[PDB]
């Protein structure tokens, strides 16, 4: 069988799979108090994409389509197209369009548009509230708010490029975004479908290992913590290699190439997440050149040493 590997990139060399920003650090903490079910950065080790996960880091939390202005408002409704500007088909067996945000929050970015006929362009600052009632990407439409009232044309290619998150209105400082709360992709009266499953540690004393980034903040006092189960480069690697999983768990060692020494060991579950043996909230202290190395296919009989 084709030999499994993980990328030899360092943490800082890799990209968050849930927002288009670099990874900064590794974090582990207890995850019992909430349901961990992100839909981006979901991939099996043998390359099967899950949830709303797609290959390109720049497409994460983007939207594409045409827009209509809502009368008397600074708001626009985008009728969603695919990443290639073709039609979006809601009957496809996915939670939402690939790359749709998988958390409840207010995402600020730029909404940009080109007029096909003459190549005239326009762009305005814009926010999407993924917890709002008109956030129905599964149905093929979402709403944006701007400061403009009169500028975007109908039936012209329009793009949302995410930049950061904001906190404002009725929420208290750092109470939003809520990274572990999924939006209702079809809106209020419809339950989500075809979700990548929630993940949790199974063995006692184990915790999830998160790949963590700090989201840019554009207004207010947002919670800028963003944790993903897999770096986007791992998703890309697994998808390409598509190496068959020889067990439920790949044993990874986090190694310092300067000294050749192993820092700690961890389990990469074939369904695409990592666990370590630790109790409590902990930011890992890692050397700048450290990376993960796949050492063996193991099983439940193998016990991780406490890190």
């Amino acid at each position: 069988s084709k030999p499994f590997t993980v990328p030899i990139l360092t943490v800082e060399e890799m990209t968050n799979s849930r927002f288009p920003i670099p990874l900064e650090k590794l974090f582990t903490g207890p995850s019992g108090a909430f349901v961990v079910q992100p839909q981006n950065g979901r991939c099996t080790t043998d390359g099967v994409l899950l949830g709303t996960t797609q290959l390109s880091p720049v497409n994460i939390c983007t939207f594409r389509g045409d827009v209509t202005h809502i009368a008397g408002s600074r708001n626009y409704t985008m009728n969603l197209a695919s990443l290639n500007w073709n039609n979006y088909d809601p009957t496809e067996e996915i939670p939402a369009p690939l790359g749709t945000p998988d958390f409840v929050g207010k995402i600020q970015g730029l909404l940009t548009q080109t007029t096909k006929g003459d190549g005239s362009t326009r762009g305005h600052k814009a926010t999407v509230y993924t917890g709002s009632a008109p956030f129905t990407p599964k149905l093929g439409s979402v709403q944006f708010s701007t400061d403009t009232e009169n500028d975007f044309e109908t039936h012209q290619n329009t793009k949302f490029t995410p930049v950061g998150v904001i906190q404002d209105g009725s929420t208290t400082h750092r109470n939003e975004p809520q990274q572990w709360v999924l939006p209702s992709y079809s809106g209020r009266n419809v339950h989500n479908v075809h979700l990548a499953p929630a993940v949790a540690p199974t063995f006692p004393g184990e915790q999830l290992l998160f790949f963590r980034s700090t989201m840019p903040g554009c207004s207010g006092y947002p919670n800028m913590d963003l944790d993903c189960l897999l770096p986007q480069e791992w998703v890309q690697h697994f998808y390409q290699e598509a190496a068959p999983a020889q067990s439920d768990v790949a044993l990874l060692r986090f190694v310092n190439p300067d000294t050749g020494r192993v820092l700690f060991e961890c389990k990469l579950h074939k369904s695409g997440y990592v666990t370590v043996a630790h109790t409590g909230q902990h930011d890992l202290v890692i050397p700048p050149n450290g990376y993960f190395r796949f050492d063996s296919w193991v099983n439940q009989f193998y016990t991780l040493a406490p890190m």
Partner: nanobody
Amino acid sequence: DVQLVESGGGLVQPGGSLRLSCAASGSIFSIYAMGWYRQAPGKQRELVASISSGGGTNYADSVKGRFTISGKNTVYLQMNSLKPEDTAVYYCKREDYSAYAPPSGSRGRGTQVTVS
């Protein structure tokens, strides 16, 4: 294949102690786990204790505080404060792991431990 030679075992006085050892040889890999399962007559097989090449250990709840496993490709089981309910056949088990294939298991013939 892999060969496991088990040592120790026998008849023990209750409240007594016994030490088991298991040595592995043959086509062994550098990443592995080793340990013991036991089966009493008319009972389900149960894990007793295991140790991994990285030093991680696992103990059955039933033997916590009484048994110690330690690991040369030989592992040792120190069984203390033995009670009649510990009477069983004890089987050494090894899993050998690689980057290229599924885990490969080997198991010893087992040794009778009788506490009475």
